[PDB]
Amino acid sequence: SIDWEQTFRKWSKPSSETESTKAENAERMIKAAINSSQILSTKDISVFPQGSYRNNTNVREDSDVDICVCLNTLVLSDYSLVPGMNASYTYKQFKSDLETALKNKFGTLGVSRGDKAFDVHANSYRVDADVVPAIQGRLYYDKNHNAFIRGTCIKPDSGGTIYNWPEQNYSNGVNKNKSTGNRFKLIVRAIKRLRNHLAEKGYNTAKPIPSYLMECLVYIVPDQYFTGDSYKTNVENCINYLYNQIDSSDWTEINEIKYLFGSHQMWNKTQVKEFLLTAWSYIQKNLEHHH
Ligand SMILES: O=c1ccn([C@@H]2O[C@H](COP(=O)(O)OP(=O)(O)OP(=O)(O)O)[C@@H](O)[C@H]2O)c(=O)[nH]1
Ligand SMILES: [Mg+2]
Ligand SMILES: [Mg+2]
């Protein structure tokens, strides 16, 4: 007998009241690591927060701050939408120099290299951050030199190319929060805590559902479903809409550029539907049946 209205209202809160301070500190310290690097301080590099701290969708106190370190002067362009359309400092050298800069500022005990990002955990600066090296990415929509959208590009150690759209994610999230009178991100956080709750209780359908996927999914739900004074009704509306529309959908991420499903993603629609069914059952009272 969970009071789901009061539970979702509680779970709609930020991870803490000091999120902005944690994110500011992470960003400042990563910039300081760059500035103290002889090689990197001479480069056109942007350091910025992304992820749930930047978007105010974080719910875990122990979430690492996501920091992007972007070398703006290396460009990778996607020409796939335009019929017929087609340096000395490399991404690999950049990533190695970034690893060295982070080890120099925070110590080797505070830095590990993953496939995509560096894990920085340095009690001395109170920094817990996932620091990803990126370059400028572009998606062309016409053959003219100016006809592109700008984002970031990641080149993992294991190969391949990842396009990200952090500024577009942030702006569209802000706009939807405005259009819903702040209910959008409240419900994102409520649903992220619901997922974490189910995963901690051993529900296997909740385990392959990542935070960013849920943020994208809730963004997809039309604004009308966020109205009213019942957070429980909002959450139910989200589950209902998503479950009944996902099969025929061709949805994008919150940036409205990248497709939410496909071979470029680690999640699929079947996982999402199974999680939605689990969440729908768990939220009900006095259910006598189980499948
Ligand atoms: O599969 C992914 C994962 C991550 N990302 C991009 O990297 C950002 C940081 O990756 P995170 O996994 O940390 O997601 P998050 O910050 O939104 O959620 P929590 O930490 O609160 O769990 C994400 O918000 C997303 O923008 C993707 O584009 N695709
Ligand atoms: Mg994060
Ligand atoms: Mg992260």
Numbering used by the authors: 2 to 87, 96 to 300
Please, what does the article write about this entry?
By including substrate UTP or UMPnPP and cofactor MgCl2 in the crystallization solutions, we obtained the complex crystals of ClCdnE-UTP, LpCdnE-UTP, and LpCdnE-UMPnPP and refined them to 2.6-Å, 1.95-Å and 2.2-Å resolution, respectively. In the LpCdnE-UTP complex crystal, similar binding modes of the donor and acceptor nucleotides to the active site were observed for both protein molecules. In addition to the Mg-B ion, the α-phosphate of the donor UTP also forms a coordinate bond with a Mg ion, Mg-A, which further shares the Asp67 side-chain and a water molecule with Mg-B in octahedral-complex formation. The other ligands are the Asp139 side-chain, the ribose O3’ of the acceptor nucleotide, and a water molecule. The γ-phosphate group of the donor formed four hydrogen bonds with Ser53, Asn59, Lys201, and Ser220 of the protein in LpCdnE, showing remarkably stronger interactions than those in ClCdnE and EfCdnE. Besides the bond of O3’ to Mg-A, the acceptor ribose has O2’ hydrogen bonded to the Asp67 side-chain. LpCdnE binds more strongly to the acceptor triphosphate than ClCdnE. Although there is some disorder in the β- and γ-phosphate groups, the triphosphate is with hydrogen bond to the backbone N of Asp124, Lys125, and Ala126 in the βC–βD loop, and salt bridged to the Lys125 side-chain. Instead, Trp277 and Trp276 form extensive hydrophobic contacts with the base moiety of donor UTP/UMPnPP in the substrate-bound ClCdnE and LpCdnE, respectively. In LpCdnE, the Glu262 and Gln274 side chains also come together to form a hydrogen bond and restrict the donor-binding site for pyrimidine nucleotides.
